[PDB]
Design a binder for this molecule. Structure first.
Ligand SMILES: C[S@@+](CC[C@H](N)C(=O)[O-])C[C@H]1O[C@@H](n2cnc3c(N)ncnc32)[C@H](O)[C@@H]1O
Ligand SMILES: C[S@@+](CC[C@H](N)C(=O)[O-])C[C@H]1O[C@@H](n2cnc3c(N)ncnc32)[C@H](O)[C@@H]1O
Lengths: 245, 245
């Protein structure tokens, strides 16, 4: 229905396709084509498009949301080197040693604990010798600050949040080496403000395309996220590891 | 982008999925299962859904608009019996004698004259003996009433309009038997009015989902169409024929 599409596109507009964060996160990543890359939680395909353009790598985007996959395919028709599939990544199987990089931006919070482990084991199998695992995800921080409105928000969206430390260790337990686990919450805050800023600046143009209710919902939502981060309820985690085989 | 989707869903809302006209047009059509049916210009798939529900027919929907096909697929999962494909019907090939009925609602105006004929020749081939061809389409009427605003509207949308009489003769020239060609413009006005009435009645609800600009565009658009029809610029044509035994 129209409501789901409207929120998908409205969020894409305010995040400017997510291109700022992707750019920075891949700024020190080096691939030689024709590398093969998997993007877990590929959304509207922006990260896949960018990775292909920057590296001329084959990119395979998986997302559980069929609407988004449909849009992604439509946005990236010509490029034979970019592929998309609608499926729960937990139900995917790829051959051993298929990928040079497996990349995932803010998708893994959607998995319960055992399922996070299950995915990382899969990722280990699917990577080529020397392959890299590259992830951002939301992590638990000051649970002593967690309150009734926060818990109900996470419970409702079905997020499963863990500390950066435990996350890094969980990856390490799947045989990954060179495991790096960094708090990038300061950068998260900066991205969030820039996105709220864009929304407020462009309110009039936004309303030509989106109903007033959505503008208000997104403004209030971004405002809450910024407040959540400033209160240190959660950290944005950055993780990089390598399959050394 | 969002604008294209918004107009697709907004028009689907005001026409209530096309249910009313589809129900009437098929009221004296009898099929036994498991008939096969082709819907040319299937849009969001509502006609396909209805035909499968009413007859337990296998239905194959073709539309040139990939966005609509994508939505149609998502709206109709379980029904193994309903299939969709994004393609120009002119580029499609089916084995001879595949279908019990070929059905098309307000699509063929999108085809230039030679292409209309090519399509009907294809339809003749694709039908089983005694198979039914069932079409509604917009036809030219009082061309002495056409003015610069009407000409520019059709030239811009790339419509090719011909008189009901010539349309009927064209179908006959492809070997179809028992060709019926009827003016249903009275019925067309009644549908248009009801759709405009729905839009005006539900303005406040419509605006929770659609931008104010779309409401105005659709209201003015439906107002124009009603005006065009009353001025007898065009007729809504009904055509039914059968392949010879
Ligand atoms: C917030 S988004 C981020 C994706 C976006 N392309 C970006 O720039 O990060 C998280 C995505 O992960 C997808 N997702 C959630 N659970 C998933 C699963 N089990 N398998 C695959 N994708 C999933 C969601 O549909 C959503 O599109
Ligand atoms: C006004 S719509 C009606 C759609 C659907 N029959 C209905 O009644 O809702 C006409 C449809 O024909 C489709 N169409 C136009 N040219 C076509 C072609 N060459 N092949 C297949 N579909 C086409 C358009 O995309 C559009 O969805």
């Amino acid at each position: 229905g129209i409501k789901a599409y409207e929120f998908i596109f409205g969020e894409d507009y305010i995040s400017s396709g997510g291109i700022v964060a992707t750019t920075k996160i891949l700024s020190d990543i080096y691939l030689e084509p024709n590398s093969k890359v998997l993007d877990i939680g590929s959304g509207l395909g922006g990260g896949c498009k960018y990775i292909n353009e920057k590296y001329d790598a084959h990119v395979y985007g998986v997302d559980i949301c069929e609407k988004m996959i449909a849009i992604a395919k439509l946005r990236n028709k010509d490029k034979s080197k970019v592929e998309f599939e609608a499926m729960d990544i937990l139900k995917k199987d790829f051959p051993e040693c298929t990928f040079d990089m497996i990349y995932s931006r803010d998708a893994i919070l959607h998995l319960p604990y055992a399922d996070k482990k299950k995915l990382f084991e899969k990722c280990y199998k699917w990577l080529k010798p020397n392959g890299i695992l590259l992830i951002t995800d939301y992590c638990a921080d000051k649970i002593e600050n967690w309150d009734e409105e926060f818990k109900a928000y996470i419970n409702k969206r079905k997020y499963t949040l863990i500390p950066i430390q435990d996350y890094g260790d969980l990856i390490k337990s799947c045989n990954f080496q060179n495991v790096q686990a960094k708090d990038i919450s300061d950068y998260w805050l900066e991205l969030l403000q820039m996105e709220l800023n864009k929304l407020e600046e462009k309110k009039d143009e936004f309303l030509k395309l989106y109903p007033t209710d959505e503008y208000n919902s997104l403004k209030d939502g971004w405002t809450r996220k910024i407040k959540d981060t400033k209160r240190h309820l959660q950290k944005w985690g950055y993780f990089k590891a390598q399959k050394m085989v």
